[PDB]
Structure formats: structure tokens, C-alpha cells
Write a protein that binds this ligand. Sequence first.
Ligand code: CLA
Ligand code: CLA
Ligand code: CLA
Ligand code: CLA
Lengths: 222, 742, 41, 211, 81
Amino acid sequence: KRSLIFASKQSLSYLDGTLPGDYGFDPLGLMDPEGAGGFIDPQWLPYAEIINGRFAMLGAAGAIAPEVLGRIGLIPQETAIPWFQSGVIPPVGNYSYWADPYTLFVLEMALMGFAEHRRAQDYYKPGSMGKQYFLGLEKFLGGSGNPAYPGGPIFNFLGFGKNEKELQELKVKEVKNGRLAMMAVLGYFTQAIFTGVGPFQNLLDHLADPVHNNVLTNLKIH
Amino acid sequence: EVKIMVEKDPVKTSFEKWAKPGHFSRTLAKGPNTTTWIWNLHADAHDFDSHTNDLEEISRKVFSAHFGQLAVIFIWLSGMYFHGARFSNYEAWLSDPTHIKPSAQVVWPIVGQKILNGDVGGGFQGIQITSGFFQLWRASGITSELQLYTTAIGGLIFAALMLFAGWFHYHKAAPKLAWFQNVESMLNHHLAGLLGLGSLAWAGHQVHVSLPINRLLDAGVDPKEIPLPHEFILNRDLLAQLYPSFSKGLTPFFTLNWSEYSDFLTFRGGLNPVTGGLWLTDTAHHHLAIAVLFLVAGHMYRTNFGIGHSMKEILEAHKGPFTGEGHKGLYEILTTSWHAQLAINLAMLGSLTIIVAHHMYAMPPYPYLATDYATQLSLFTHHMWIGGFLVVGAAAHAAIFMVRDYDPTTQYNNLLDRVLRHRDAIISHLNWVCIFLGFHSFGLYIHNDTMSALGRPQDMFSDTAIQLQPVFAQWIQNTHALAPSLTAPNATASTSLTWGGGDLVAVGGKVALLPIPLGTADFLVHHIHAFTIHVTVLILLKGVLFARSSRLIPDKANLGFRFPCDGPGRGGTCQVSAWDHVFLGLFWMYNAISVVIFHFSWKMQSDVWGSISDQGVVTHITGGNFAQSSITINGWLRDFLWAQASQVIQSYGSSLSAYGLLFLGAHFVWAFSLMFLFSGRGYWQELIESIVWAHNKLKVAPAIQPRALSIVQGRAVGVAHYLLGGIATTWAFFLARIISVG
Amino acid sequence: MQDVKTYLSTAPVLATLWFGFLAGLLIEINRFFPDALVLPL
Amino acid sequence: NDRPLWFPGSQPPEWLDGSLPGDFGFDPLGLGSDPELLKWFVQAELVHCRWAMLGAAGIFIPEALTKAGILNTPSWTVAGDQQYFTDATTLFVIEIILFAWAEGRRWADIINPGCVNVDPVFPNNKLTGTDVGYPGGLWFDPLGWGQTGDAAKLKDLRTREIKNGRLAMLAVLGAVVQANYTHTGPIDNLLAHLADPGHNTIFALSNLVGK
Amino acid sequence: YIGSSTNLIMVASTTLMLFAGRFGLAPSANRKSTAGLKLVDRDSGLQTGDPAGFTATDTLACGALGHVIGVGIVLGLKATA
Ligand code: CLA
Ligand code: CLA
Ligand code: CLA
Ligand code: CLA
């Protein structure tokens, strides 16, 4: 009834198809309900997958966007730099923003804490973020039964998924693009170490001379 | 099927049981009727088997206790690194390692103890440390105290992490028994993932951090201008000018042209002449090879993907005519008894620590380690004592398993049953060999004593007398000295400078290592070692094999593992319990390790350690008198105990005065142990009755009735104080002597 | 807090606290009034 | 009782039922589990708050007025070093003697509520305070604002000194740490932060790996 | 490098090991070896698209062992000749 990648008899017992990206791929049995615990349990792993995938969608489309936009020539060239040279890893490269990266990190930690702690409290205690006063817009951040899909007036303001069939198909599309983006960010990291140039540079090098520009020829690092 | 299985919130995190001391046991949870209760509270705290019969709960307690121990060790290591960062002269020692004594402990000026802040060199005053941490950090490529600080902060973070992990895996997500019984998965992960990956990671560190920094250090570059490790990782041209093979850049690894990595992956052997330690290229290649070997070996057992080995089927398939079912039922023993696993692992860890002690002096793995005689002696003695204690503990827990965890129904005509069934023959022959060894070693010493006292030196057992040459050890040394010539052609030097070849490494004006000669004295001392080891094994194995029953008490298993006696009947049943056998094996291990460390100290101070002059004349710390003085017990009393103790007793008024103080205090503690060992319990109980009368006369008698220590507790206190006093006496004596003469 | 206070009131914890306080007092006294064999009065 | 909490999602502790001023259910270590000790901690917080308010008013206001040039206060940290009409140790001992009376009377009020409300010299003065920690009367509440009748409005009047007090406690702790770290006055630190907030921060003097 | 002796040796070793595992000439996930070195069939529980029963774990195991053997042969032939 569905595509199976590397399913097993054990995995197919609890993976039936309710989840969007459910294809029975669980060779390690990490979502077995018999031994559910703190973070290794059926309720958390799909949520963690969705969140890692969404941040990976932002990363794969963000770690290469400045380089592409500078290659086509509409952002300043000094901002058109590989992702690892944007101050995230100062040794390989650094950039001077309005604030030093540790002050930026503290601000990021404060803002992301205010967001992430609320997300956590809605995961553990659903609907708890729509009661206490929060600058008057606590009613927008109420969420729904499913922690991964709040779908409020803010988190869903174009109103997709009016019907359940399109909603589920859109969920599956989200999960697939997220898995692809996660693998893409892993590729970004490994290629950054092994090549020393940005992902778009690697793509163009491969597109130029595919047989002399690949992993086999380019594990000489430099 | 190998899967993750836990239970959510098994134990509520509450302080309610903190207020109840003896909560873990039904007997102690009532309250302290007598003072014995207090001692019992501390003697049954970690005996989790006695708390309950549930194996799942025992396994959970053991896991969380291991997490706590890991947190404690992390705190200890973080403390060492902190004290290296602040209260140490590590950088001054880096500038001049041959003339500055390592020091990482500074005392406060309170009661005149400030004299202990001796002049160690480098504009620093403190306690001279002998732990070898300076040399280890030199090998790791540490050049600044900031790196030690960050290591210490990471150690504190890891200690907090381990503490939280223990809390989480006891009170929040506690693994079930099926999880603990997955021994195949545990072995695969601890071989491939723990040892193999750890060795690979350390090889990576060595390749990228230790080798370049240490080769710049060997060249004479001041550590201040030595580039930082990340500059070697990033600017790979800077790393390639030290080892050109890095310019190839992982191409040889994947093209299998591995010989191109011969620049930094060598098989030299021997010692680096500049530092006196092992070549770090050899160490890197070593760690890479063992990482590969462990990662391969960790793919042996079948977890859930087929392809592998069932250890139960391996064991059940190994049996022969001289045995019964062979290794049948041992899988259940080792998957259902924690004490059996503890016995095996303790024995292996003790033997491994003894191997470490023997191998770290013959091949000093750290720079400026051999010439630091104090560090060498301390490391050898420390690890010898640790190994001996672990072996005795293995015997103790084997006995505990035999008493409590042994099930005759599931063990019929297997190896354990058959060993139990001819224990009489085993102990008979072991007793005979113990007597024979004791005679033909110590009686040889007594013969030497007598002929020396009778004025008949030609009738002794020496090199100038009847000679007992260790021809087999000499042949092994000869074979190992010629190994690079014919047997290991891809070797530059032999395994160690101790085998032979006439090569002498002399860092500074001292002697690192040289060919160690073996003669009649070495023959005698090795046979003394064999005698002591066989007698210790006799005591411990007789305790283990006769723990359940004997011809005297056929129901000793019902008596338990830790009981004083069965009464004055049958002539007297004093110390029939296996616990008492461990109690005596502790004394015999003490003697064995003491003689071993004395032999090491005298042999090194006499034949190896010393100073070499510009001309090339090598003088030794003692003067090479081991070959002619170690053959006589008077020689040991005079040339070793009396001659080499001149410094601990004359250390008063100097920075070594603490060693003399602790020398005498350890003597005191040993003598104090003697009365717990010699006395009984009725005498002290009656004395306590008289003292209680004195207190009752003044209405100050406590409601918690004072009681004398139990018989088993009396023995435990006696042996603990005895070992502490003896070992601390030797510790002070060695440390004072080797700091004075080095 | 009842159980925590009860635990802190146990013999070993109270012994540690009391003896540490006594040791600190003696050490500080010796800091300010050291090496005295005779009570001056 | 459906009150705002320090952590919106979580439930509040059972001993923190919201009947105390400044209650937000913040007790993650459970140090208020003993009600008899909880009352003592309530008093301790109240006096700590009221002392830290005076500390902040005597630290930041004089510093700001000195920077403005109106006063010449010596930066509140060397304030102890300057010369006065008496020695510092003698001043401390006078302070201990003079505070023993007041602190002991407050202690007696805490231990035995309702007592020590009457003037010993002139019994006809008395203190018209009912709750512990709020002595009231005329010396302590000369404007008669602590007696309102409405419990809710009185609690609203409270929970303000608790909040200003907690803020002032944090402010004084920050002033101490900032003087120890930056070796500079607090208002000067404020002006430095406002000069370039992106760089004049705690990491200005830390000098970490990358900048 | 494609025509090099090292490449040929490694390819041959990996292909031979994969062939042996796939065609029942070596132990696999569904092919257990007894004490007599006779291959019996077992239910590993891993479903695979291979009609014979070659799984992804079988492929990984055979490839790993083939690489091990090929590295051994390559280094041995280099050291000897
Ligand atoms: C989103 C997935 C993705 C994509 C599209 C690419 C694409 C590319 N990679 Mg990257 N890579 C990835 C994941 C990915 N990689 C991951 C996960 C790793 C870590 C193992 C790497 C590690 C890596 C290195 C070290 C190198 C490349 C290189 C390359 C280039 C091809 C030449 C080559 O030797 O490939 C080698 C490819 C691999 C080692 C990964 C293969 C397996 C992954 C899962 C990709 C599977 C692709 C699959 C068809 C899905 C594509 C999605 C879509 C385009 C249809 C090309 C630009 C080379 C380069 O930059 O050339 C100049 C190079 O040196 N990649
Ligand atoms: C690659 C996987 C792996 C690794 C590295 C380890 C490593 C370790 N295990 Mg083993 N273990 C594993 C898999 C693994 N285990 C599996 C699959 C099981 C179930 C069958 C067990 C069951 C098990 C038991 C029952 C016990 C251990 C213990 C230990 C520790 C022994 C102390 C020591 O010498 O460590 C030296 C190294 C260190 C001290 C480094 C610090 C630890 C780092 C962070 C590695 C931790 C790896 C961890 C397994 C990853 C999961 C945690 C993650 C969710 C954060 C050691 C850290 C013993 C112990 O001490 O428990 C605490 C113990 O009693 N393990
Ligand atoms: C991996 C190591 C390991 C582990 C996990 C255990 C675990 C256990 N052992 Mg085994 N044991 C070990 C090593 C180990 N032991 C070694 C090396 C020896 C040889 C000495 C023994 C000998 C031994 C015996 C003989 C007995 C145990 C017992 C026990 C149980 C503890 C119950 C108890 O009273 O402890 C609570 C803890 C203590 C009593 C320790 C108190 C402190 C000791 C006695 C002195 C400390 C010396 C100190 C270093 C001196 C300097 C400091 C001082 C100045 C303050 C528990 C199952 C007992 C048991 O299971 O009974 C059924 C038991 O009878 N063990
Ligand atoms: C110096 C003190 C000393 C001596 C000499 C001995 C001697 C002995 N012990 Mg004892 N022991 C001692 C201290 C000592 N122990 C202490 C302090 C403890 C407490 C831990 C123990 C605990 C202990 C246990 C628990 C065990 C022994 C065992 C042994 C025996 C070792 C093997 C043997 O019999 O052949 C060697 C014998 C000797 C070295 C004795 C001296 C013989 C000399 C060399 C020759 C003299 C004879 C000469 C011809 C003179 C003849 C006299 C004639 C004229 C009357 C032996 C009887 C073990 C045993 O039963 O034997 C297997 C055993 O299990 N002992």
C-alpha cells in the first residue's frame, strides 16, 4: 500500500502509515512503543524530526542564498560569502556586524528562549500558552492538539489545508523537503571540511568538469 | 531482540529517605538499638543484592552508582587540571624540563607548614608532584595554562553531566532487565564504539596536535612562539613542512598507498634521544592500528541483524572428554549474576594494571619521564598496589558469587561443578607447590645469610659462588634484542632498551634506560615473587572453592559469605568464611607487592638509574650492589632498608619533612592495626561494660547501647589499618628517598 | 524542607559542620595569634 | 488560583497558593516547603528587599548626580576609605549597638507576633500594625497608607515593594559584580552601554576567541 | 587509477565476497553457519527486495569484509613484490 525503504518485521508492527513520512524505515527500532522513554518514544521523535527538518530547510536555503544572490549580482559582494565565513566559525572566517557575535549570541539565546520554552510548554502541556497574559497576543499562540502543527492565526495566516486530504499531502511534502534539507546541511558540513569553498562553488565545479571535480578527486582537501 | 527498554519515573526524587538512614534494608530501617547499627549502616549500603531479590532494581542501582563514580572521577581530573593551571609551574617546566621539579600543590602559611613549599625551580614554591601529569600534558601538546583551565572547566561540565545522567537513569528513565542482559550488544559497542573509536580519536589528536607541537619542542623552539594546534589543523602547509606526507592529503589513505605516510606513522621502537620517551609517530601508528583492530573485533556478536556470534552457542559448543558439558550454563551465570562479572572484570583489571606498571617503565611513553625517577617509581608502585587490590577483590567477589548466586540445579557436570568436585586435589597440589617454592627461595636466602655469617662466602648462592643463572630470561632478552635483525625486519630498534644492544639513552646528565642484566639475585627474587603469588592464590582459591561447604562445616553456604565462625566446636572454626580468606589474602598480596616494589626500587637505583658524565662514565644511585647484596637478607636490611632510609629520617626541617612525619605516622597506624588483629571481642565488651558503669554512675549513659566491634569488623579494621600503615610507610620512604637522590 | 533539615541534623553532617567550623576558628586564631607557648596574662 | 506565574505552562507549588504578596509560584528548589520556615523566609525577603532599595538609592542616585556635577560622592566603593569624624571600626560597633535594639524587637515580633508593639518609655504610643513585617503605626507609617481595609487593594499596595525590592536586590548585586569586573562606576557602565550597545557589553572586557 | 592493480584487486575481492554472500557461498543474515560449517536458513526478520534474500545489512557486511580482504591482499603484494 506504500513504498518501503528498509522496513523490517519489527518496524512494520508499529509503523502503519498515520505519520506523513511513514515508510517503515526503522532498522534500529528507535520508535518501538514497548520501551518508550524520555526522548526515545513515539511522541517525540516525529516532532524532533519535523523541527530538525524545518531548521534544516532554513539552513539549506540560507547557507547558500547569499552566495547565489551575489553570484547573480544583486547583493553586495562583501556579503556574498560562504556560510562558514560569516562569523559562525571565526577561525575560518569572520564578519563585522553591528554587534560582536557573542552579544548577538546572547540576544539570540534570549529571543530563541522566549520562543522555544513556549513551544516546549505547549508540547508538554497543550493549550497552556493561551491562558497567561502575554502582551495581549497569547490568544494567537494557543496551538492545536498536534504540537508540530499549531496552525493559529499567526502560524497559519494564508490558511492552507482547509480540507484534510490536501492538508495531509502538504504534511508529507513538508516532511520530504525537510529530510532533503537535513541531508543537504550534512553535505554542506562535510563539503565545507573537504573542499574549503561554498556549496554553490562545489556545484559549479561539478557542473564544469564532472569527472575531474567530485569526491574522488577532491578528498585531497585543497 | 536487542531493543531499548526503559521504565518512566520508577523512583520519585524526594528527600524523605534521606532522613531515614537504613531505609535500604528491612533490618536497619527499624532504628539504632545498639552502636553496631551505625557500622552496619555503612557495611550494607552498597550491597544491593542484600537490599532486594529483584535483579532489575539491582542493575539500575549499579548503573547509577557507576554514573556517580564517573562524576567523581571527572571532578578529580578537573581538580588536577585546575591545579596545573593555577598552582603549578608547568610553563617554567616547559621552558626547562630537565632542571625544574614538577609542582602543582601550594600550601598555606599557617602553622609553619609553609616550609613544605620547597624550592622546586622556575621561580615557584610548592609540593613536588610525582603523578606524571606534567609529562602527560607535554605529550598531549599542552603549552599554556589556559588550555589546562579549559580542560578543567570541561571536566566540571562532564562531572555535572554524569551526575545528571545517573539521576536520569535512576529516577526518570530506568533501563529494564532485558536492556542490561544484552551482553552481545554491550560488547560490540564497548569494543567498536568505546575502545576502537576512542583509540581512533586519540590517534587523530596525536597526528594533528601532539606530533607537530612535540617535534617543535624537541627542536628547541620556545613554547611561547610554537603555533597553536588549530593553526596546524587550518594552515596545513605549516603542518606539512614538519611532515611532508601531509601534502598528499588523504589520497594515500584511500589509494592504499599507505607507505607514503611513513613520515608520521613509523615503527621505530626504542626511545627518542632528546626526551627519553617513546616516539609519538610510533604511538600514533599504534593507536591507529589498535583502533582498527577493535573496530573490526566489535563486529563479532549478533545483536539483531543476523551476521554474528551467539556467545551462548559458542560456550555450549566447547566441551571435551576430560570435562563434562564444558562451558554449559556459564552464559546464565554471567548474564544473571553481577558478582561473577565483577570477579572476572576485577581480575582482568588488576592484571592489566600490573601489565601497565611493568610496561610503562620499560617503555616510558611520555617525554622526560624516564629521567624523572620519582615519577617512574611512584607510577610503578601505585599501579602495582592498584592491581594487587583489584585481584584480591576479584577473589572476594568470586567467593560472594559462589556463596549467594550459585545455583546447583542449573550447574551439573559443567566446569564449575567439576572444579568444585576436585578442589581437594587442586588445593593439595597448590599447597605443595607453595611449600616447595617457599623453601627453595627463602631457604636459599637463609642459606646465604648463614654462610655469610659463618665466614664461608664460597658456599653461598651468588655470581662469585654457586651460580643460579636465569638462562631462560636471558635467552628471551637475547631473542628480543635481535628481533629487528631477523624476526621483525621492519623495526629500527628493539621493543625496549632493557633487552640489550649496548645502547644507553641519557637525557641531560641522567640515564633513561639501559640493558638490565639478570643474574643469581634476579633468579632468587623472581622465585620469591612466584612463591608469594602462589601463596596468595592458594589462600584466595581455597576460600572460593570451599566457600559453600567443606569436610568441617558441610553447610557453610547457609552460614553466608561474611560470618565470623561456627563456634568453638570441631576444635575451633575460626575464620572459616570466604571473607576471612580474602582478609588473609590481603596480607599476602601486601607482602607480594611490597617485595615486588622493593625489588624494583633497588634494581633501578643500583643498575639502571644514575648519572652519565661527559667522558661517558655511568655512576648509579646506589652503586651496583644489588648483584652481591640482594642475595642476603642482611643485605636487604642494611643496603636497602637502612641505607636508603637515611633520607626520610633526616628530612626534618626541609620540604621533605612531611614525608618523615607520615613515615612515622604510618608506622603508628600499622602498630595500631596490630591490636585489632591480635585482640578479641569479649575483652573489649567487658571493658565497655565497666566504662558504661562509670557513665551510668553520672547519668550520662547513652540510650544507643555501646557495643564492641563485631569479630568480622574487628578483622576488617585490623586489615585496613595494617595495609594503610604499611603502604603509607613505603610511600613516604620511596618518595623522600627518590626526591633526595634524584 | 523537613526531610532536608532532618538529614542535615544527622550525626555525620552535623559533625562535619561543627568540626569544620572549629577548624576554621582555630586556623584563623593561629593566623592572627600564632606560635604561642605561654598564655600572656 | 489561575494567577500569572514565573513559568506560564507549569503548575505552581502547593505551598505557594498565591496568598502571599509577590507570589508567582517560583520555588524550583522547594525551599519554602516548611510553612514555619516559609514565614521566616518571607520576612527575610521583605527585609532584604527594603535594605536593597536603600542600597540602590544610595548607590545609583548619588553616582548619577555626581556625574551630572551636582554632588561629589566618591563612587560608593571607596566610600569606606574616606575620613570621617570617627573611625570605621568604632562606627561599626556603634551601628551594632544601635541596631541590636531594633533588630531584636523585630525578632521578638517575628517569634511572638502581637508583642513589642507598645512603647516601653511611654506605653500610650503603641503601633497599629497587625501583620508581621509591616509594623505600621506612626513612626513607620506616618501617612497611614498600610491600613486600607480592602484585602485585595492592600495586597495590591503590597507586591509593589516586593517587586521594586527584588529589582533593587538584583541591581545591587549587578553593581557589586560590575564594580569588581569592569573597575568602573555603574552609571559610567550605563553610558558606555548606551554609547555602543552592540559592543560595550560584558564581552567587551572578556576577549573571547573570535571578534 | 581505474586500471591499477590495487583497483583491480579491491574490485575483485568485493565482487567475489558479494557474490559468495548473495549466492549462498558465505554466511549472511539469513544464512547461519553451524559448528560443522554447514549453512542453515534463519528468519532474520529483515525484509529485502532481493529474491534470494540478500539484505542491506548483508550487503554492508559483505562489502566490509571484501574491503578488509582486499586491503590485506594489496598490502601483502606490495610488501612482497
Ligand atoms: C542533498 C544531497 C546532496 C547533494 C545534491 C550533493 C551534491 C553534490 N555533492 Mg555532496 N554530500 C552529501 C549530500 C549531497 N551532495 C552528504 C550527505 C555528504 C556527506 C557524506 C556529502 C559529501 C560530499 C563531499 C565530501 C563531496 C560532495 C560533492 C558533491 C558534488 C557531486 C560530486 C561528488 O563526488 O559527490 C559525492 C557525493 C557524496 C559523497 C554523497 C552521496 C550521497 C548523498 C546522500 C547524496 C545523494 C544524492 C541523491 C541523488 C539526492 C539528490 C537530490 C536532488 C539533487 C535530486 C555535488 C555538488 C563533491 C564536490 O563538492 O565536488 C566538487 C565532494 O567532494 N559531497
Ligand atoms: C558506542 C557506544 C557506547 C559507548 C561509548 C559506551 C561507553 C561506556 N559505557 Mg556502555 N553501553 C552501550 C554502549 C556504549 N557504552 C550499550 C549499547 C549498552 C546497553 C547494552 C551499554 C551498557 C552499559 C552499562 C550497563 C554500563 C556501561 C558503562 C559505560 C562506561 C564505562 C566507563 C568507561 O570506561 O568509560 C570511559 C569513557 C568515559 C567516562 C567518557 C564519558 C562518557 C561519554 C559521554 C560517552 C557516553 C556514550 C553513551 C553510551 C552515549 C549515549 C548517551 C547520550 C544519549 C548522551 C562508558 C562511558 C558503565 C558505566 O560506567 O556506566 C555509567 C556501565 O555500568 N554501558
Ligand atoms: C569495581 C570494584 C568493586 C566494586 C564495585 C565492589 C562492590 C562491592 N563490594 Mg567489593 N572489593 C573490591 C572492589 C569492588 N567491590 C576490592 C578491590 C576488594 C579487595 C579489598 C573488595 C573486597 C570486598 C569484600 C571483602 C567485601 C566487598 C563487598 C562489596 C559490596 C559493598 C558492600 C559494602 O560494605 O561496601 C560499603 C563500603 C565500604 C565498607 C567501604 C568503607 C571504606 C573502606 C573500608 C576503607 C577506606 C580506605 C581508605 C582509602 C583509607 C584512606 C582514607 C582514610 C584516612 C579516611 C559491593 C557489592 C562486601 C559485600 O558484598 O558483602 C557481602 C564484602 O564483604 N568487597
Ligand atoms: C616470617 C614470618 C612467616 C613465615 C616464615 C611463614 C611461613 C609460612 N607461612 Mg605464614 N604467615 C605469616 C608469617 C610467616 N609465615 C603472617 C604474618 C601471616 C598473616 C597474614 C601468615 C599467614 C599465612 C597463611 C594464611 C598461609 C601461610 C603459609 C605459610 C607457609 C609457606 C609455605 C611453606 O610452608 O613453605 C615455606 C616455609 C618457610 C619459608 C618457613 C621457613 C623455613 C626455612 C626456609 C627453613 C628452616 C628449616 C631449617 C632446616 C631449620 C630446621 C629446624 C629444626 C632444627 C627444628 C609457611 C609455613 C601458607 C601455607 O600453609 O603454606 C602453603 C598459608 O596458607 N601463612
